[PDB]
Design goal:
Number of domains of chain B: 1
Distance between the termini of chain C: 37 Å
Oligomer: part of a larger assembly
Shape of chain C: elongated
Helix content of chain B: under 10%
Subcellular location (chains C, E, H): Virion; Host cytoplasm
Order of helices and strands of chain C: EHEEHEEEEEEEE
Distance between the termini of chain B: 48 Å
Shape of chain B: globular
Bound molecules: ligand FHK, myristic acid
Chains: A mainly beta (237), B mainly beta (252), C mainly beta (269), D mainly beta (55)
Structural class of chain C: mainly beta
Strand content of chain B: 25-35%
Protein name (chains C, E, H): Capsid protein VP1
Number of strands of chain B: 13
Helix content of chain C: under 10%
Order of helices and strands of chain B: EEEEEEEEEEEEE
Number of helices of chain C: 2
Number of domains of chain C: 1
Structural class of chain B: mainly beta
Number of strands of chain C: 11
Largest sheet of chain C: 6 strands, antiparallel
Largest interface: A-C, 97 and 99 residues
Number of helices of chain B: 0
Radius of gyration of chain B: 19 Å
């Protein structure tokens, strides 16, 4: 016949290969398709959807709904911190089990902007202002309000419209950052402070909560598939 | 202006003064089955305005400690009106829904609810080698309630109900990929979702498959000071959309 | 795919893109130029690794069974499901309904078993793997008439060659496979719950076609599933708990996340 | 009956189908259409950013 | 293929499609819209799996024989018929006359046999399978002159390679093979009944070409028939009884169906 | 001398014959013609449904 | 020669496969066809034929 | 490529091509015809062997590890770097920044280990090599759930076949790999120096998929890297000293050159 | 979709790409462009041989 | 299938060979290039650069 020669990689099973293989059932006609609502064609469709972030998660809070709630209250003075967590989804305790964060433990690399939304869930007599800050890395976390207003920030005023978005720009030396912890591809720190006290009248609760959401922007992308560390087994089920 | 809404289906009309828009499904509005997707060869029954109209279910109190509630959709309307009398005489049917959840409280109250319509919400059992009975999953217009503590494992046909796993073994804060709205008491007093028919078959029997489950879950507890109203109800109202039925037989 | 950043200068306007109402059930479409001054960036990034036909289209080991050329356990039986093994199962359960064609690939190995047999001298082993569609005869022994394979798909494989593979169509009676079923198959609503016949796709049998040696040899067959030509509908939250059973969604209650010291601390515990 | 298509780059390749079943073909890797607007913005009224979400 | 349902409204007419006479030997052409109100359905179903060249065109094991590299039974003899094995035979006997080309495929395996031979050390086995058309010399021993294969088709196969295969034309002297013959070959109408020479297609011989080992090895050859290019005429009721013999249609009387409790019961026994 | 034919779908493939005998060719899988009217309705007179079978 | 590479599924015998294989008898001409009544080309031809149903089937 | 010599006659001119200033940091562009009488030569020589995509594009052994089918060391772990082995490493360090695609090729061999096991009789060995991208589960034993390979690239190889190979893209987060890093990853400038995450490209695992024999077999896997599609920037002086460590540039001070007797001697010592 | 290119000689060959990734292609051997003027003569002022380097 | 024949040099690993081989990561898009000063495309570029010669090299 036709003289041929085999090359390295013949008679191997590579799990990522695409080759054609004969059907075991030939001339089998499959059932028609129907239009089912909500077809998914990309996983960045469903990473652009808001998901409640468990900011609190200190001891026994993860075994309750108190994880999702962020305390804020009427206190003396202002310029006290409300929360702080580091930017690094798919590593951080805060972000690893969010909807964004679990489409990001299947990938090694990530790029793009992330938008946090906050929703004030006090009474309609409560009012206040917050400073929602993001600091690039290289100087540690800000420990005062005056240190935190030197970074990117938004001042949020609560009225009608009970949410505000802090969009986190992409500021990185590299085009991608590792999903896993590395100090070369450090993300920075996201902190919140009282710009002004929570002020309430009599007969309205002086303790209120904030809920946080996280989603990707439209410039976001992920790269390089890998197994997730979050599912295990000891035997077949 | 943007906060006023009116929805008219059959006899019924709903009117709200505080509204967060209407969420529509996956961007698909209810429609009748096409003749290029149909399998069954009989002529459908389409009752129209005798099935497709709002039905109020029983109210349930929101307390400072309340974990949440669920209703499984075709089997929460199964005893109500002629909706309930067409699904026991027919083998098949398909319908979408408009779910409207109401909860009004003063401007000195606070709290937040998540209102989700979850396709095929299959729920675990407390005992790991059993599956739940149908008397632990299905109400009939009475709401089933979640728990805040794990259900102990006996020799149970009980559901494993915990708010934070949502009774399905998933994070409860990730239920926001399903069509949803929030009722935040300082903003709005109602939530409207319009579900289309979601299934992997064009019609299905409705007395052994529940293709949607409504869940109302507090994320921020109800709180108020002494002197305020201490009883705040949550009412659920559900209207069929484009109901069809096929396969007429005897009742049962 | 990825969109280009657009430059923006100072603002002072009645526009309020940052303020929103998240009660509406709508994810805000705010981009970075809204809240701050940005430069114009050209992006050449792509979203080609996060396609559903990249995510699910890699071979994954679903099961393995053993069988011997002597004594009991002469053949292996397995009902095809992608739910015995955690990793593949979790990926498919990002969706409620999926539709795909399989490609089965079999890695069959053999291991000499300890014995006091003198003068063992194996011949090459040939293995038969037989796919039996739902219903029809089931072999009850090695050397039954069911291994004739007159109308059941079957492959034969001699050792030291490439793994066998075969493609399977989409075999559902429905218009998609369902990964979740919130119902009973009985009209009484009694019996097993979450059991449905949309996901049937037969049983697999495997045996030795010869005992080559006078001594005992035990083989292990590993089955790999690779979805292809995938379509998926209705996304779901990922599984948070460990799986317990292959037919149930049953779980042990698990905390939302791992803990940390304070709500201001920048490290995990 | 060969198809010629572009490769993934930061050229072209040739493919012939050899079998009579369309379930024997290699996986479709290069389909990049997407539409996140079903899951984000499922609201009936059109939301305009730079205008109040609630009047 | 499958036809589309057509919508129908109420009737009250002198038409009577439901009433018929079944004495005429004609199957009624009534469709569902005749007897009831129907909707219009588009059908996209096909009848492509029920073609005769799908039904009969899968490999099926017809026979297997054994032979050894020592002692008696040095070779295997088999007269080619698809009537030794039940499953293939039943499928072909949905028809009276069939015409097809074969494809033979051979799965040859070897197994070490127990002995007290010290220091066995097999070389690779090579096997010869020889097809002998009707008439002509028949080997009477391993190492006869008939295995020269000067004009008899033959294949040689070394172990650990792909199964051999060869195509055979349609070899009948008639215009179709017959699966049934209601006659005698003798003009006296004596002798064997149902025996005919339309289905002759030689004999198959198989041996080892070397004894590789000093110890005894026994091989098993399995023959697979795959019809292709099929044409079939005159359909027949399926076989209801178990087969007894390969040359006869002889049977043990069997009941029509399995029983049940009553003529109103909805379960089987 | 290649044939290009359509695949079974819910594309196209290429086939070349390599042998000089037409009994060496692959099986004919895609022949879907049929005529049930030999075995159903073998009657000499034409039966019309919506009319008596016997007058 | 031409550089080639083998893939999984080489040297297997799949019973449902369609491949070409050389004839053992080359240049053999087959007997002509005749028209025989009642050719069957599909099995749904012969499933559309009435068949007496054994409704009773209770004991003997 | 190579340029042609041009003929020249006598000169006596105010031109001074031979005189130059080498302080300017400019290499003189003097050709032989400037300083002497030359003939015209046609050159047909080429510079095609000294392309960067010839110099670096040959397979080079980077590492080898061993693992056994019994006892301890059931699998082999290796973090992919081209810096364990001297020869490949030196060639890449003619440049500061390089960008290329790998082709991995594995030469896997097995050797019987001495034992007092009677009646050993190995079956063919099958090996699994599993590439794990940075992060994600790491196998901690042979027979963990990580060897499922649901989303990790993996190959399986049976003995006596061609070496496996696979191509790897350019996997850097940077726009080129760096062979030198004059910094710390920490902002404090503490910890390890010269450590960077631009050159991460996972870990490789290798095991036996079966123990074929009753006796002990030890395998050795050798990994070969072949750069291809290369681009390189900023050339550097070659390494003069022997390497000490794979993560450091540390060296023992070495003389400039080897010695000789005098500055007028025409031989080496 | 075949490319035909010249061989290294003191004829032509044919190549087809078989894979959908451009990192699967054979090495580029025949790229012979070069520019030594970055590393030799990096000076701002143009040096002319047959004229003083320094006036 | 298509009758083929293998030649000497099949199933060998020649270290200088150029053949195509499937990617282990398909559809992976690589990071963009940037212009970095001083690209090298030939080694005769960097052999045409002056280098100080150690003419003396006698003992210490
Ligand atoms: O290697 C993999 O592909 C592979 C290894 C482990 C695996 N999943 S596991 O949950 O870790 C697991 C771990 C062990 C066994 N298991 C055994 O090791 C074993 C030995 C003998 C009989 C039965 C079994 C058996 O069920 C089954 C599953 C999947 C695949
Ligand atoms: C269109 O298909 C014709 C283009 C040229 C085809 C070359 C075919 C390559 C070799 C045959 C592959 C056949 C697979 C059954
Ligand atoms: C028509 O047959 C010519 C079309 C191009 C043929 C490509 C042939 C593929 C390789 C040869 C197959 C030869 C089989 C004997
Ligand atoms: C352009 O590519 C068409 C030119 C003729 C192609 C002959 C193809 C040779 C055989 C197929 C190689 C296919 C690799 C996937």
């Amino acid at each position: 016949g036709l003289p041929t020669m085999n090359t390295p990689g013949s008679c191997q099973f590579l799990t990522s290969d695409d080759f054609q293989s004969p059907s075991a059932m030939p001339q089998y006609d499959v059932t028609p398709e129907m239009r089912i609502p909500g077809e998914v064609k990309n996983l960045m469709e469903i990473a652009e959807v808001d998901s409640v972030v468990p900011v609190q998660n200190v001891g026994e809070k993860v075994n309750s709904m108190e994880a999702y709630q962020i305390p804020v209250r009427s206190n003396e003075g202002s310029g006290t911190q409300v929360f702080g967590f580091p930017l690094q989804p798919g590593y951080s305790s805060v972000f690893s089990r969010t909807l964004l964060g679990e489409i990001l433990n299947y990938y090694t690399h990530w790029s793009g902007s992330i938008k946090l939304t906050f929703m004030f869930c006090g009474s309609a007599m409560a009012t206040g202002k917050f400073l929602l800050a993001y600091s690039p890395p290289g100087a540690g976390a800000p420990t005062k309000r005056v240190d935190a207003m030197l970074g990117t920030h938004v001042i949020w005023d609560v009225g009608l419209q009970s949410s505000c978005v802090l969009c986190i720009p992409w500021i990185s030396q590299t085009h991608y950052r590792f999903v896993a912890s590395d100090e070369y591809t450090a993300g920075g720190f996201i902190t919140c402070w009282y710009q002004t006290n929570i002020v309430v009248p009599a007969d309205a609760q002086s303790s209120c909560y904030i809920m946080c959401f996280v989603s990707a922007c439209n410039d976001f992308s992920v790269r390089l598939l890998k197994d997730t560390p979050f599912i295990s087994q000891q035997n077949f089920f | 202006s943007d906060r006023a809404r009116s929805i008219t289906l059959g006899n019924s009309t709903i009117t709200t003064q505080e509204c967060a828009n209407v969420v529509v499904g996956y961007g698909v509005w209810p429609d009748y089955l096409k003749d290029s997707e149909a399998t069954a060869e009989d002529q459908p029954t389409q009752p129209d305005v005798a099935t497709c109209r709002f039905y109020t279910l029983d109210s349930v109190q929101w307390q400072k400690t309340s974990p949440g509630w669920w209703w499984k959709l075709p089997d929460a309307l199964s005893n109500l009106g002629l909706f309930g009398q067409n699904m026991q005489y027919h083998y098949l049917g398909r319908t979408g829904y408009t779910v409207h959840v109401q909860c009004n409280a003063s401007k000195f109250h606070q709290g937040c609810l998540l209102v989700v319509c979850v396709p095929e919400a299959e729920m675990g059992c407390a005992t790991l080698d059993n599956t739940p009975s149908s008397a632990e999953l299905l109400g009939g217009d009475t709401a089933k309630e979640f728990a805040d503590k794990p259900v102990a494992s006996g020799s149970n046909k009980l559901v494993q109900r915990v708010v934070y796993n949502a009774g399905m073994g998933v994070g409860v804060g990730n239920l926001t990929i399903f069509p949803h709205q929030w009722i935040n008491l300082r903003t709005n007093n109602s939530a409207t979702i319009v579900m289309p028919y979601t299934n992997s078959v064009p019609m299905d029997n409705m007395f052994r498959h529940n293709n949607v489950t409504l869940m109302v879950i507090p994320f921020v507890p109800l709180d108020y000071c002494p002197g305020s109203t201490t009883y705040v109800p949550i009412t659920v109202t559900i209207a069929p959309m484009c109901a069809e039925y096929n396969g007429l037989r005897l009742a049962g | 795919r990825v969109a280009d950043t657009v430059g923006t200068g100072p603002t002072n306007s009645e526009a309020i893109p940052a303020l929103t109402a998240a009660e509406t059930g709508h994810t805000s479409q705010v981009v970075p130029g809204d809240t701050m001054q940005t430069r114009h960036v050209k992006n050449y990034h792509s979203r080609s690794e996060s396609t559903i036909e990249n995510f699910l289209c890699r071979s994954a080991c679903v099961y393995f069974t053993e069988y011997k050329n002597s004594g009991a356990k002469r053949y292996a039986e397995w009902v095809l499901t992608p739910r015995q093994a955690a990793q593949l199962r979790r990926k498919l359960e990002f969706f409620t309904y999926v539709r795909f064609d399989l490609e089965l690939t079999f890695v069959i190995t053999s291991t000499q078993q300890p014995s006091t047999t003198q003068n063992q001298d194996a011949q090459i082993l040939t293995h038969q793997i037989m796919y039996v569609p739902p219903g029809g005869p089931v072999p009850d022994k090695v050397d039954s008439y069911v291994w004739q394979t007159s109308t059941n798909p079957s492959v034969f494989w001699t050792e030291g060659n490439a793994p066998p593979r075969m493609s399977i169509p989409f075999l559902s009676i429905g218009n998609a496979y369902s990964n979740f079923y919130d119902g009973w198959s009985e009209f009484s609503r009694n019996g097993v719950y979450g059991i449905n016949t949309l996901n049937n796709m037969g049983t697999l049998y495997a045996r030795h076609v010869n005992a080559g040696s006078t001594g005992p040899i035990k083989s292990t067959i590993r089955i790999y599933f690779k979805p292809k030509h995938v379509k998926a509908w209705i996304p779901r939250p990922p599984r948070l708990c460990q799986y317990e059973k292959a037919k149930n969604v049953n779980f042990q209650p698990s905390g939302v996340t791992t803990t940390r010291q304070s709500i201001t601390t920048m490290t995990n515990t | 009956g060969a198809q010629v298509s572009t490769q993934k780059t930061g050229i072209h390749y040739t493919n012939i189908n050899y079998y009579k079943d369309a379930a024997s073909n290699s996986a479709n890797r290069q389909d990049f259409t997407q539409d996140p607007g079903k899951f984000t913005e499922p609201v009936k009224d059109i939301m305009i950013k730079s205008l109040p979400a609630l009047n």
